[PDB]
Curated annotation (Swiss-Prot), chain A:
Residues 703-1012 are annotated as: WD repeat beta-propeller C. It comes from Homo sapiens. The gene is DDB1. One of its GO terms (molecular function) is protein-containing complex binding. This is DNA damage-binding protein 1. It is found in: Cytoplasm; Nucleus.
UniProtKB/Swiss-Prot annotation, chain B:
Residues 36-268 form the Lon N-terminal domain. Substrate recognition component of a DCX (DDB1-CUL4-X-box) E3 protein ligase complex that mediates the ubiquitination and subsequent proteasomal degradation of target proteins, such as MEIS2, ILF2 or GLUL. Normal degradation of key regulatory proteins is required for normal limb outgrowth and expression of the fibroblast growth factor FGF8. Maintains presynaptic glutamate release and consequently cognitive functions, such as memory and learning, by negatively regulating large-conductance calcium-activated potassium (BK) channels in excitatory neurons. It comes from Homo sapiens. Thalidomide was widely prescribed to pregnant women in the late 1950s as a sedative and as treatment against morning sickness. Thalidomide was found to be teratogenic, causing multiple birth defects. More recently, thalidomide use has increased for the treatment of multiple myeloma and erythema nodosum leprosum, a painful complication of leprosy. This is Protein cereblon. Belongs to the CRBN family. CDD domains: CRBN_C_like.
UniProtKB/Swiss-Prot annotation, chain C:
Component of the eRF1-eRF3-GTP ternary complex, composed of ETF1/ERF1 and ERF3 (GSPT1/ERF3A or GSPT2/ERF3B) and GTP. Component of the transient SURF (SMG1-UPF1-eRF1-eRF3) complex. The ETF1-GSPT1 complex interacts with JMJD4. Interacts with PABPC1. Interacts with SHFL. Transmembrane segments: none annotated. The chain holds residues 300 to 495 of 499 of the full protein. It comes from Homo sapiens. It comes from the Eukaryota. This is Eukaryotic peptide chain release factor GTP-binding subunit ERF3A. Signal peptide: none annotated. GTPase component of the eRF1-eRF3-GTP ternary complex, a ternary complex that mediates translation termination in response to the termination codons UAA, UAG and UGA. GSPT1/ERF3A mediates ETF1/ERF1 delivery to stop codons: The eRF1-eRF3-GTP complex binds to a stop codon in the ribosomal A-site. GTP hydrolysis by GSPT1/ERF3A induces a conformational change that leads to its dissociation, permitting ETF1/ERF1 to accommodate fully in the A-site. Belongs to the TRAFAC class translation factor GTPase superfamily. Classic translation factor GTPase family. ERF3 subfamily.
Length: 1106, 382, 196
């Protein structure tokens, strides 16, 4: 099997943050590391500059300035022990990051320490200290000629090291750290010999420190020394001086992160584990000029933040709060305590999907393309996120205004549009635009008692209006009617269209051709058509200086789209379409200098052809469905190219790269539109539906839009019950062991603030309470919150129909968790039903074990209980009776099924295949593969290949094809992200790729996986090896080394996968590098030398799956 | 309640005068290919850390051992998977740590004490013209996995993963689980599930069952490394050969510890293997009379190795003859051959104290080969 | 403790000297002793252990011993010196535990062979054999066997040619071990159990 992995949403969590002068010594930079991404901002009273992609998981990131360098330099160390030193270079308009030194600092032997990689840089900028493995201390000298990052180790007597830091104010490279031996926790200092290469006894040491000493902060000059943080005490250490405080305001939670505010070292920031924010304050006294002695240490609570991972003060009192549990914050902290309490105020809020514990795909906007709803965050940062693929719209003004059946912009004075004409049912009005304020005006020469079918500026400084009965032509200089056209028998006009010089209206089955001359409309031709006309267009296409020689038609009964020639009306091409629905709108436009004809049907079908202007031939037809309601086709311009807006129930913007891209628009419904370009709303769009006129600008390319639904409690699982238009979500909130019965909540959450709240039992330290939440698919209000039993843990959730019961139930598998019993001895399976506005508890099943997962298996419910898989049948008496039973060796943690297969896994990579045999009412082991390793989630790709994520952020694929029960190891790939859930589905409309599987991540990254044919995998593998020679890698990390399947014990090359990110970067290199990449390639189309546009058409076909 | 001295049986004092002892240790590199000789008559699945005594009589066996005592002292013990399976695929190395060749009666006899060292996969078997076989083997590595939280730990909480040593308790383990597995809320599973795959927690759960059998101090007797611990418990589990093979095929201590805990809980009854339908003893009567545990391998005067599980009470057994102290594996106790009352198959021996001050005054020694573990209410290793 | 010295060979020199390996107890100069088969008293003169002379000597060493007493030859190998208090058992019939190690067919009662017990060598006949015993278990056989083949253990009664000095195992090791022998081949080895 050969597969394709592509990132669809870059990671959002923040591994770390640091400030410095990296772009220019005059600038102040903010550097954020979103796992395998590096974001470089510039601070103002934030400005994006450059974001780059490391071929590694960023583990250590620090800024520093070597002896004789213009600006600060950046040091990066990846989880695979890649070290590099980076400089910022700007040649004018081309931002590039050049690598100065690089090298792998991995040691052939060693046990990685428990506290993880710790990187430090001495203040003299002479060395780089790293604590990679236990009992050792790798050191890199920072000589000018160390372009290989040659480093050496230094043995350590202390094995269990907590945290280390380079000391300020020492003429020798001095480190200071906390360690733990069986005698307790202590603190020591060492001095490093860069030449003699050993440790010399340091200044001071003070054994028997606080029991929970965890954080070491080096205080710069003049203070010097270090600060020690713990659960109980904040202590100072410099020489024989020993200051120690124990403020009770921090004994309630643990300090996790810190940051220096002022470079002197008097004000420090303290980040809590629950989101609190503290400011440490050091009291100085300047005895004389020179010496500065430390008097006391004070700490104040400043307010609540997002649960912070990294913190950095910026300037003018603003602080960046980088988080991995919730959204990242930009906070301004004042000196005045706010009315609610403390002195913190949020400014901006950066979206963050991590962590993703579960997610499901849903067709929320009726049918069509899928949307993705995740359980994101933890604790008070708990939230649901709704992610849709489409184009955004920046609403500049919304006006309640029903009945709008037409929309046209108008230039009342010769430039830029200034007037908007609105056609209602059998009537017409005119709006005038003075700035951003809209007011009703009248337009002399325009008739305001008829339904307008078209109006707009035309040639010879004139206007026009095509009502149901007339074709009025208005002047601009005095602004009044100059020539009116009607039907000879004064009959009503059916359909009309116009450009700037020609006008072609139609009446019943007859159509007329008019030209726009000064003060005149010269009628020309009037051919009769076989059947009633539906829509026509006279767009001037291309090349022609003003007027078009073609006329596109759609006819009733015949249901034939036709191209006629002007003014002869000679049938240049007839095309018969479906035959049950009449056409509703037609349009001729051109994309990327290619000439297409479009035509929409009343049922929402959309045909697009290829047009030969001189020949009138409509060929290479292709059809796509956009919505159930009728469609209207309109042309507009954005980014100096002409797009096509398709108004309907599912609005769609058509653009383009010689491949039409139908992109959903993030809007409810749009019936009519027109491009507006005014003095107050420039280069914008005017939208109109049944009740609203909306004006605003539109983005250029479709991204991912994310709607946050905060829950203020940790969500756990999620499923979609469509027949009720609601979501079922498992959640857990934290309460505290209180007086009397206890269990008083912390804060108002989504389970305490539900509409109707149920429970499972009355009252007849931290403690977790689990809930089943019912959430409306449209409002996202908590409709109901079921609270499970005391000491009950909700593990699984699934919404399905069972047996021959038409009711769709919510099924939840639980497990009783008492702290004295290690393995849970009993759990339950509950079957809820959400009818109207109630949650009826339909049935229960007391089970002697946990229920780690469930799945709907061919109308029957299949559940896992410890090491047992049990199949349940749904009775006619509304109960669960057992049909089968199957024991295993493995704890049946993971459960996925396709057809009659069943794939069972556990936390130990162990995988089982099971098959339902109806003629026996039992199961049979089909295959297995045991290779002990930590596994986070699995999924079934097809009947023979199975995907999973193992330890060290990897992926793998097993394959079926006696000893035909062995699963082979056919796919490996180091994704660099902790996959946490797989689910089928896509985020694009309904063939190089086969299948589609999305997945979430702890870092919030959303990726996709699909299968490929051997022909493409062979070619695209050649594509990879060709791009690796060309594309400049940050830190000079080998791509093959990055994607190599990694464990602590083994490291094999990746196979059976394709880094789609690398393949997609083929469209970002310059044009010569493309021709450089295609150095004599054998491309196949039924073989020759391949070009650059040969692979662009290939890669663009791959970018259209996410 | 007892006073025997659990250190006596492990010494195998019945073998006689102190043997020559070796201090050196030989360990082969992981995945390396090695050719190691196989002893023709050894019928056992040896697990690493288990002591194996042997009495070799045949000159071909004696000659091969004299050469081995001069080289690496390591022989291969093939683990036979099936009864009629000619080819062996797995096995365990045995390192001779004590030996003695004696010309007593007039026949050269060689007594040896070996210990299981490294597991291997059999690649080839070559029989020499002498009957001693050589095994081309691949040393199977011991797969050590990191903490389950290592790939899902927050760098800010790294300095919190170290805990100060525990007091020699119920409240402490609750705080251990909460702190080590705090970052479990970033995954699909709760803390209590990760606890089920934590070596330290699993080892503390096993100790709770080993303590029910012996008043042994956890501090020393039981090793602290899960690898060594997992193998030590497997050696004293009274399971059949098919189950013992499955445990040896397990490369992870975690998988081994969980599978052992499930065996210790599921299989409570021990029936006669020949009958299958005759209860002999129960797990409630199992107790450890040797530092190795309730079951250890011992050699009879003719070199037959018996893994003998010591139990307080047994039923449905008839005693043939009178007690004897000759070659007693538990010095101070006399043995009486015990056969099954139904099928008359030899199940083991009853041990009766020779001195009135000894406690227990009587117990039964059952040979693992004769017993079959049964689940109340084929056993499957979880 | 008790003393046992299986006599290997005597030779007339000085008064009278005797050879053997001294297996039980210590032997002092002039320590009165006895000779078991004929109950002859005898007093020590000279203890020439190794080539050196020592007044007393402990078990293990290889002693030449000058004997003062009514012993001037007419002492055969397979006699023993004995502590006069608890001296050695004797006779000519005894039970023993005999493992057959080499024999092409079957041995049955009335089988004639040689019997090597310490220094003594005297022809022997197995009068009747009592009970087989299984090697795996230790199970004393239910019925009397009519014969025993190779690689098999049993307990049997044995009559030597005439009056020899036997000692049961458990009581004494070196004198309680023996090897049946025929055609120079070693055919069985045996520990002695009872004394008939
Ligand atoms: O605690 C225990 C429980 C009992 C267990 N035993 C003793 C035993 C003795 C014999 C028959 N003896 C002999 O065969 C002999 F050893 F007594 C012998 C006699 C003469 C000669 Cl020449 C050589 C050996 C057969 C089998 C066993 C057996 O399985 C054990 O070993 N220690
Ligand atoms: Zn039986």
């Amino acid at each position: 099997s050969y597969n394709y992995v592509v990132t669809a949403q870059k990671p959002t969590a923040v591994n770390g943050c640091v400030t410095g002068h990296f772009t220019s010594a005059e600038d102040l930079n903010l550097l954020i590391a979103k796992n395998t991404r590096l974001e470089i901002y510039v601070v103002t009273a934030l400005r994006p500059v450059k974001e780059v992609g490391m071929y590694g998981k960023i583990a250590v990131m620090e800024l520093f300035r070597p002896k004789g360098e213009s600006k600060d330099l950046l040091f990066i160390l990846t989880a695979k022990y890649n070290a590099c030193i980076l400089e910022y270079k700007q040649s004018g308009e081309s931002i590039d990051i050049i690598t100065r030194a690089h090298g792998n600092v991995q040691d052939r032997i060693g046990r990685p320490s428990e506290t993880g990689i710790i990187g430090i840089i001495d203040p003299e900028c002479r060395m780089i200290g790293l604590r990679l493995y236990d009992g050792l201390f790798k050191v890199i000298p920072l000589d000018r000629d160390n372009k290989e990052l040659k480093a050496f180790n230094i043995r350590l007597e202390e094995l269990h090291v907590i945290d280390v830091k380079f000391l300020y104010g020492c003429q020798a490279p001095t480190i200071c750290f906390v360690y733990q031996d069986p005698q307790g926790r202590h603190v020591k200092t060492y001095e490093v010999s860069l030449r003699e290469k050993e440790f010399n006894k340091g200044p001071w040491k003070q054994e028997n420190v606080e029991a929970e000493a965890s954080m070491v902060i080096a205080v710069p000059e003049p203070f010097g020394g270090a600060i020690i943080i713990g659960q109980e005490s904040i202590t100072y250490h410099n020489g024989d001086k020993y200051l120690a405080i124990a403020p009770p305001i921090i004994k309630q939670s643990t300090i996790v992160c810190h940051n220096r505010v002022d470079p002197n070292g008097s004000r420090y920031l303290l980040g809590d584990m629950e989101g609190r924010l503290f400011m440490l304050l050091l009291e100085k006294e300047e005895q004389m000029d020179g010496t500065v002695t430390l008097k006391d240490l004070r700490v104040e609570l400043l307010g609540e933040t997002s649960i912070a991972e990294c913190l950095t003060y910026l300037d003018n009192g603003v602080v960046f709060v980088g988080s991995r549990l919730g959204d990242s914050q930009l906070v301004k902290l004042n000196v005045d305590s706010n009315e609610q309490g403390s002195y913190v105020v949020a400014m901006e809020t950066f979206t963050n999907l991590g962590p993703i514990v579960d997610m499901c795909v849903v067709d929320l906007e009726r049918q069509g393309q899928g949307q993705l709803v995740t359980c994101s965050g933890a604790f008070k940062e708990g939230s649901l996120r709704i992610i849709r693929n489409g184009i955004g719209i920046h609403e500049h003004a919304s006006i309640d205004l029903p009945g709008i059946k037409g929309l046209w912009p108008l230039r009342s004075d010769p430039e830029t549009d200034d007037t908007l004409v609105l056609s209602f049912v059998g009537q017409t009005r005119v709006l005038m635009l003075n700035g951003e304020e809209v007011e009703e005006t009248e337009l002399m020469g325009f008739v305001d008692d008829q339904q307008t079918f078209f109006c707009g500026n035309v040639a010879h400084q004139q206007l026009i209006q095509i009502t149901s009965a007339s074709v009025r032509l208005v002047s601009q200089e005095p602004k009044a009617l100059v020539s009116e056209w009607k039907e000879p028998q004064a009959k009503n006009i059916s359909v009309a269209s116009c450009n700037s010089s020609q006008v072609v209206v139609a009446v019943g089955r007859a159509l007329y051709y008019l030209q726009i001359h000064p003060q005149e409309l010269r009628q020309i031709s009037h051919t009769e058509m076989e059947h009633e006309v539906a829509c026509l267009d006279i767009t001037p296409l291309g090349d022609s200086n003003g007027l078009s020689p073609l006329c596109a038609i759609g006819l009733w009964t015949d249901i034939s789209a036709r191209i006629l020639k002007l003014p002869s009306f000679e049938l240049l091409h007839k095309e018969m379409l479906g035959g049950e629905i009449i056409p509703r709108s037609i349009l001729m436009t051109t994309f990327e200098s290619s000439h297409y004809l479009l035509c929409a049907l009343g049922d929402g079908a959309l045909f697009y052809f290829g047009l030969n202007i001189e020949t009138g031939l409509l060929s290479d037809r292709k059809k796509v469905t956009l919505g159930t309601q009728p469609t209207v086709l309109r042309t507009f311009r954005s980014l100096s190219t002409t797009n096509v807006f398709a108004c309907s129930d599912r609005p769609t913007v058509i653009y383009s790269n010689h491949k039409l891209v139908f992109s959903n628009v993030n809007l409810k419904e749009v019936n009519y539109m027109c491009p507006l370009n005014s003095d107050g709303y420039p280069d914008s769009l005017a939208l109109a539906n049944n009740s609203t006129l909306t004006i605003g600008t539109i983005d250029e390319i479709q991204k991912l839009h994310i709607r946050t639904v905060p829950l203020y409690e940790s969500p756990r699982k999620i499923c979609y019950q469509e027949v009720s238009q609601c979501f079922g979500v498992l959640s857990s909130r934290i309460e505290v062991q209180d007086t009397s019965g206890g269990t008083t909540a912390l804060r108002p959450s989504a389970s305490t603030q539900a509409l109707s709240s149920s429970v499972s039992s009355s009252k007849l330290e931290e403690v977790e309470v689990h809930n089943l939440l019912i959430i409306d698919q449209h409002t996202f209000e908590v409709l109901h919150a079921h609270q499970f039993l005391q000491n009950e843990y909700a593990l699984s959730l699934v919404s399905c129909k069972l047996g021959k019961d038409p009711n769709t139930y919510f099924i939840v598998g639980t497990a009783m968790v008492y702290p004295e019993e290690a393995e849970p001895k009993q759990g339950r399976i509950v079957v809820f039903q959400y009818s109207d506005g109630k949650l009826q508890t339909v049935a229960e099943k007391e089970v002697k074990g946990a229920v780690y997962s469930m799945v709907e298996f061919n109308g029957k419910l299949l559940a896992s209980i410890n090491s047992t898989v049990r199949l349940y049948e749904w009775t006619t008496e509304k109960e669960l009776r057992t049909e089968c039973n199957h024991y295993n060796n493995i704890m049946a943690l993971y459960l996925k099924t396709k057809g009659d297969f069943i794939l069972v896994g556990d936390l130990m990579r162990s995988v089982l295949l099971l098959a339902y045999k109806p003629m026996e009412g039992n199961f049979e082991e089909i295959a297995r593969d045991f290779n002990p390793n930590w596994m986070s989630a699995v999924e079934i790709l097809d009947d023979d290949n199975f995907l999973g994520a193992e330890n060290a952020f990897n992926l793998f694929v097993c394959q079926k094809d006696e000893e035909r029960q062995h699963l082979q190891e056919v796919g490996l790939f180091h994704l660099g992200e902790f996959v946490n859930v797989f689910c089928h589905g896509s985020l694009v409309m309904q063939t190089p790729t086969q299948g589609s599987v999305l997945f979430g991540t702890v870092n919030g990254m959303i990726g996709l996986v699909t299968s490929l044919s051997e022909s493409w995998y062979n070619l695209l593998l050649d594509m990879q090896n060709r791009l690796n020679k060309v594309i400049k890698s940050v830190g000079k990390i080998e791509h093959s080394f990055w994607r190599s399947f990694h464990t602590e014990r083994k490291t094999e090359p990746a196979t059976g996968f394709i880094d789609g990110d690398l393949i997609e970067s083929f469209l970002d290199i310059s044009r010569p590098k493309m021709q450089e990449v295609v150095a004599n390639l054998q491309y196949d189309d039924g073989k020759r030398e391949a070009t650059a546009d040969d692979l662009i058409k290939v890669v663009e076909e791959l970018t259209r799956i996410h | 309640i007892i006073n025997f001295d659990t250190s006596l049986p492990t010494s195998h004092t019945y073998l006689g005068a102190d043997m020559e002892e070796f201090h050196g240790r030989t360990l082969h590199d992981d995945d390396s290919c090695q050719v190691i000789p196989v002893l023709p008559q050894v019928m056992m699945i040896l697990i690493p850390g288990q002591t194996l005594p042997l009495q070799l009589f045949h000159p071909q066996e004696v000659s091969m051992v004299r050469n081995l005592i001069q080289k690496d002292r390591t022989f291969a013990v093939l683990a036979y998977s099936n009864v009629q399976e000619r080819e062996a695929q797995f096995g365990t190395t045995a390192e001779i740590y004590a030996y003695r060749e004696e010309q007593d009666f007039g026949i050269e006899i060689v007594k040896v004490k070996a210990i299981g060292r490294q597991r291997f996969k059999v690649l080839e078997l070559r029989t020499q013209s002498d009957g001693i076989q050589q095994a081309k083997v691949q040393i199977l590595p011991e797969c050590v996995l990191p903490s389950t939280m290592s790939a899902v730990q927050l760098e800010s909480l790294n300095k919190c993963q170290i805990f100060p040593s525990k007091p020699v308790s119920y409240k402490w383990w609750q705080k251990y689980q909460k702190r080590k597995f705090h970052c479990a809320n970033l995954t699909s599973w709760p803390r209590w599930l990760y606890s089920l795959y934590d070596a330290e927690t699993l080892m503390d759960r096993i100790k709770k069952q080993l303590r029910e059998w012996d008043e042994n101090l956890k501090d020393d007797s039981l090793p602290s490394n899960p690898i060594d611990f997992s193998y030590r418990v497997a050696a004293c589990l009274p399971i059949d050969d098919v189950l013992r093979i499955q445990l040896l095929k397990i490369g992870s201590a975690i998988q081994r510890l969980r599978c052992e805990l499930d065996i210790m809980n599921k299989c409570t009854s021990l029936c006669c293997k020949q009958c299958q339908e005759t209860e002999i003893t129960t797990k409630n009567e199992i107790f450890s009379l040797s530092l190795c545990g309730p079951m250890a391998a011992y050699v009879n005067p003719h070199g037959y190795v018996h893994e003998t599980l010591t139990v307080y009470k047994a039923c449905n057994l008839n005693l043939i003859g009178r007690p004897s102290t000759e070659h007693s594996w538990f010095p101070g106790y006399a043995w009486t051959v015990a056969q099954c009352k139904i099928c008359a198959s030899h199940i083991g021996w009853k041990f009766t104290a020779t001195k009135k001050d000894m406690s227990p005054q009587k117990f039964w020694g059952l040979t693992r080969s004769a017993l079959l573990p049964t689940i109340p209410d084929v056993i499957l290793c979880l | 403790g008790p003393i046992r010295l299986p006599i290997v060979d005597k030779y007339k020199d000085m008064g009278t000297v005797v050879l053997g390996k001294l297996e039980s107890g210590s032997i002092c100069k002039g320590q009165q002793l006895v000779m078991m088969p004929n109950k002859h008293n005898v007093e020590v003169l000279g203890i020439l252990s190794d080539d050196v002379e020592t007044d007393t000597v402990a078990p293990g060493e290889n002693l030449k011993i000058r004997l003062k007493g009514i012993e001037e030859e007419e002492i055969l190998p397979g006699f023993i010196l004995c502590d006069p208090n608890n001296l050695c058992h004797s006779g000519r019939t005894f039970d023993a535990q005999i493992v057959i190690i080499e024999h092409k067919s079957i041995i049955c009662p009335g089988y004639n062979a040689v019997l090597h017990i310490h220094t003594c060598i005297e022809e022997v006949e197995i009068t009747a054999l009592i009970c087989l015993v299984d090697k795996k278990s230790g199970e004393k056989s239910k019925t009397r066997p009519r014969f025993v083949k190779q690689d098999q253990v049993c307990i049997a009664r044995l009559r030597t040619a005439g009056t020899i000095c036997l000692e049961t195992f458990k009581d004494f090791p070196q004198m309680g071990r023996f090897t049946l022998r025929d055609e120079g081949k070693t055919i069985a080895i045996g520990k002695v159990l009872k004394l008939v």
